Ligand binder design. Structure first.
Ligand SMILES: Nc1nc2c(ncn2[C@@H]2O[C@H](COP(=O)(O)OP(=O)(O)O)[C@@H](O)[C@H]2O)c(=O)[nH]1
Lengths: 298, 296
């Protein structure tokens, strides 16, 4: 089965994240941008662009109505997918209100439905935080798995201006999608295919992600240690009952290194965790390896 | 007009999406027109010509199109052949399609509608609006190619496969014919003979077949003629179009075997248009499309 994967970015933040995914060369997926601004969509490099809410301000009820009014068109665009990602920055109107509609359509159609969203920075204000909380609750009900990335924890990583901060958010949304899709589209020595991913992500519920990267001697152990200690995982890894871990490297990434990383992750996980390890070939990476952990159930 | 001017109009979200699929797959030799009919949403398109007359209901799309009839006419003027489709799903496109078709035909273009019947498992929305859409489009077209998606389940299909299959055959509803006209092969056709079987023909059905290796042309042609999408309309059809696509190496003998088979299968009084299409990207595969129009 050659899986058909679609990645939907909805609202300003989601469409910007999708643009970043395109710029960084994420392959094997169809990119769909949904927003309420036709000029912003003209700039997007997505394969499919839908402008919603045309007759209808950070009001999630407006975003929900705009998506619901477009539900036949969204369903037309998603029909045939085996897997749909719905990506957004939570806390605004279009993404907050519309993402559960998109996800519900994908789930009704039986696609493995993965949400990947951010919680807003605390400095964006209490209304955005409250709106994101409600949007996440709604989205969680419409997704198989919902990966939630707390933007506040990004400020504990990396170097930083406001534009820089939101570029880092774009990048972590990319990392969350690509960490999963590259297992399917560009596997390495340890092949974790669509059926395996569906096995662990179907109905898994809320999830967190951690990412790490390293180079040179001991890179895989270091990358895995960084990933499982990631601030984005909220010190929660030991409580997860389901863990998907992908390690990406060049063609020469060897079984010994892979196994070193897997063993570290096993030792850190809950005694009863179901953990699936997969590898990715990415010949652009040079001497670097990148470990992505998705932790769910919990 | 010794290069037939063919315009392919996608109207509504499903029809625009279908046109976008055709562009992505590199359908050559035709002009693409994307007409958005919804006020509340716009599906963007890479088509050459775009018209947003919206400013989900068949009557809404009909009035949107009627209100823009002068602009649509100017887009279509000069065409020898116009395809019109609302693609998969319903909505406002189902109301707009017969307006565009009526304009094309009043202009003198050979007007070919393409319409899908949804899978039975999709259910049915009220007033028999889908079948009313087919009847309205039929009344406005020279030939209406009807694709019954239910028959795809006879060609073990998964739900995602079923939806992808429907999209692929809709694309073939256009490309099988336009390639025969626009892309050279060993056996080429006169557009006048295409017009001869499709003008005023009414409903048509399509069959598709593919095969590889020895005997591939006969094999693919047998599959196409027996396709469940033709609903055994083949024996009674009074007009038959058949195109064989394959590489430049397709041999005259195997081509002629496939042509002989379709003549044997067709009604004795059928008009039959036959030709081939050189598509060197197919490798050793051949792809046959049969269009059966009219009836006994
Ligand atoms: N990844 C990313 N997130 C953003 C960006 N701009 C804003 N955000 C986040 O996304 C949330 C929603 O804003 P936005 O997507 O513009 O609102 P919407 O268009 O109404 O859904 C904001 O509160 C920010 O946390 C961006 O450029 N990239």
């Amino acid at each position: 089965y050659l899986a058909v994967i679609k990645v939907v970015g909805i609202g300003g933040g989601g469409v910007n994240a999708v643009n970043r995914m395109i710029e960084q060369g994420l392959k094997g997926v169809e990119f769909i941008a949904i927003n309420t601004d036709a000029q912003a969509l003209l700039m997007s490099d997505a394969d499919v662009k839908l402008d919603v809410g045309r007759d209808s301000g950070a009001d999630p009820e407006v975003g929900r109505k705009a998506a619901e009014d477009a539900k036949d068109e969204i369903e037309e665009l998603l029909r045939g997918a085996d897997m749909v990602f719905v990506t957004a920055g939570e806390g605004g109107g279009t993404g907050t209100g519309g993402a559960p509609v998109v996800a519900s359509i994908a789930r009704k159609l039986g696609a493995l439905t993965v949400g990947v969203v951010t919680r807003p920075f605390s400095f964006e204000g209490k209304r955005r935080s409250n709106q994101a909380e409600n949007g996440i609750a709604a989205l969680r009900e419409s997704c198989d798995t919902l990966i939630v990335i707390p933007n506040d924890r990004l400020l504990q990583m990396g170097d930083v201006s406001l534009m820089d901060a939101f570029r880092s958010a774009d990048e972590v949304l990319l990392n969350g999608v690509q960490g999963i899709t590259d297992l399917i589209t560009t596997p390495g020595l340890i092949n974790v295919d669509f059926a395996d991913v569906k096995g662990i992500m179907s109905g898994a519920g809320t999830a967190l992600m951690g990412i790490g990267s390293a180079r040179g001697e001991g890179r895989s152990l270091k990358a895995a240690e960084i990933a499982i200690n990631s601030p984005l995982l909220e010190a929660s890894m030991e409580g997860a009952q389901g863990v998907l871990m992908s390690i990406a490297g060049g063609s020469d990434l060897g079984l010994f290194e892979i196994n070193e990383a897997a063993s570290l992750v096993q030792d850190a996980a809950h005694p009863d965790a179901n953990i699936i390890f997969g590898t990715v070939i990415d010949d652009s990476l040079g001497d670097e390896v990148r470990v992505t952990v998705i932790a769910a159930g919990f």
